[PDB]
Amino acid sequence: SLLPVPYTEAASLSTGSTVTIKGRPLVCFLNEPYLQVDFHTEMKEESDIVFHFQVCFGRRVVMNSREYGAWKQQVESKNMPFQDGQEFELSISVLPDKYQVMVNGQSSYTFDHRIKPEAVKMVQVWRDISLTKFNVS
Amino acid sequence: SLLPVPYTEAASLSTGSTVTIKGRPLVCFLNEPYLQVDFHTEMKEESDIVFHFQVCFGRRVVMNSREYGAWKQQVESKNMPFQDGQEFELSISVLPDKYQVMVNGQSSYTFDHRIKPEAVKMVQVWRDISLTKFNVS
């Protein structure tokens, strides 16, 4: 029932789209496992990133974009709704002005659009998780 | 021919021991894949770490120890012998005073012993790599 990780899926997004991910960190929070979700402009892994969401479980979350190969202004959050050793459900909704990140049904992070979500062609979910579900509305 | 990752093996070390790892990052350096090698005091993942070696490919290496659950003084290196998109051979040798880390046959990092290497009971190799070989002399 596990999906391969790194997980790559071609995707198209617009206002109203939701990306839902169900997974579990591979190790305890003391070990600082990571989760990364990247919305790419092309199927290639080295392409630009419209939205980069990286969790360091139990510590912090960083968000950014990678434009013409360069990381832009990093946004950091210490909000940590993820629970040690538990399965999580993460949903990323495309709103007119921003992305809204729900964790286990709780609004947890937002990121204003820097590039139109229509530029997205691929989503990659990777780092230290097992993945059971991935869906795009 | 691939080994499972995270990879955990019971181990005993002393002066003269060598831990050899052969693997490949799962993604390009632009994506900053990580490699982590931890020498633990017990088979449990949450146990103390005598030697923590973490690579952020193309950026930096950090080394530390985790004693009674707390990270101690971090050591950082910008030395980056690892090559983008290539298979690497990493060897960690236990010398009387320190660990010596060879990357593709080149001495690349050292870390003075903070705890006797005889305290090690397990080695864990994890993060964003595929692993083809793991050996302890």
From Swiss-Prot, chains A, B:
Complex and partners: Interacts with CEL.
Higher taxonomy: Eukaryota, Metazoa, Chordata, Craniata, Vertebrata
Major site of localization recorded for this protein: cytoplasm
Functional description taken from the UniProt entry: Regulates immune responses through the recognition of cell-surface glycans. Essential for the anergy and suppressive function of CD25-positive regulatory T-cells (Treg).
Keywords (A to Z) from UniProt: Acetylation, Cytoplasm, Lectin
Name the record gives this protein: Galectin-10
GO cellular component: collagen-containing extracellular matrix; cytosol
Further facts: Forms hexagonal bipyramidal crystals, known as Charcot-Leyden crystals, in tissues and secretions from sites of eosinophil-associated inflammation and some myeloid leukemias.
InterPro entries, per the entry: ConA-like_dom_sf, Galectin-like, Galectin_CRD
Cellular location(s): Cytoplasm, Cytosol; Cytoplasmic granule
A single GO BP: T cell apoptotic process
Tissue-level expression: Expressed abundantly in the bone marrow. Expressed exclusively by eosinophils and basophils. Not detected in monocytes and neutrophils. Expressed in CD25-positive regulatory T-cells (Treg) (at protein level). Found in intestinal tissue from patients with Celiac disease, expression is directly related to the histological grade of mucosal damage and to the number of eosinophils found in the duodenal lesion (at protein level). Found in sputum of patients with eosinophilic inflammatory diseases such as asthma (at protein level).
Molecular functions per Gene Ontology: carbohydrate binding; identical protein binding
Domain of life assignment: Eukaryota
Annotated source species: Homo sapiens (Human)
Site residues, Not glycosylated: N135
Domain Galectin: residue ranges: 5-137
Modified residues (N-acetylserine): S1
Signal peptide: none
